[PDB]
Nucleic acid binder design. Structure first.
Length: 40
DNA sequence: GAAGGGGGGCTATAAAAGGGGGTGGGGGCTCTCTTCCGCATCGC
């Protein structure tokens, strides 16, 4: 995966934008899904 | 037919006369925010 970084990312944070260049969502699994690849 | 020659008109100078014509001068690239339109929704 690729995520915007450096100056272009700094702009998105201070130029707060409705549509980021590379929106992302880090999801953490709660139950047995976290420790089981099949269940994940 | 080329070339030199001769005769005559053009040029300026003043001045008057009177009118036509010439001349010049007026006038009828990217990101963000805002606005408008179509739609579906309820309401009465």
């Amino acid at each position: 995966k690729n995520v915007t970084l450096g100056v272009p990312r700094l702009k998105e944070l201070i130029n707060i934008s409705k549509k980021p260049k590379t929106p992302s969502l880090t999801v953490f699994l709660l139950g047995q899904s976290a420790r089981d690849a099949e269940r994940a």
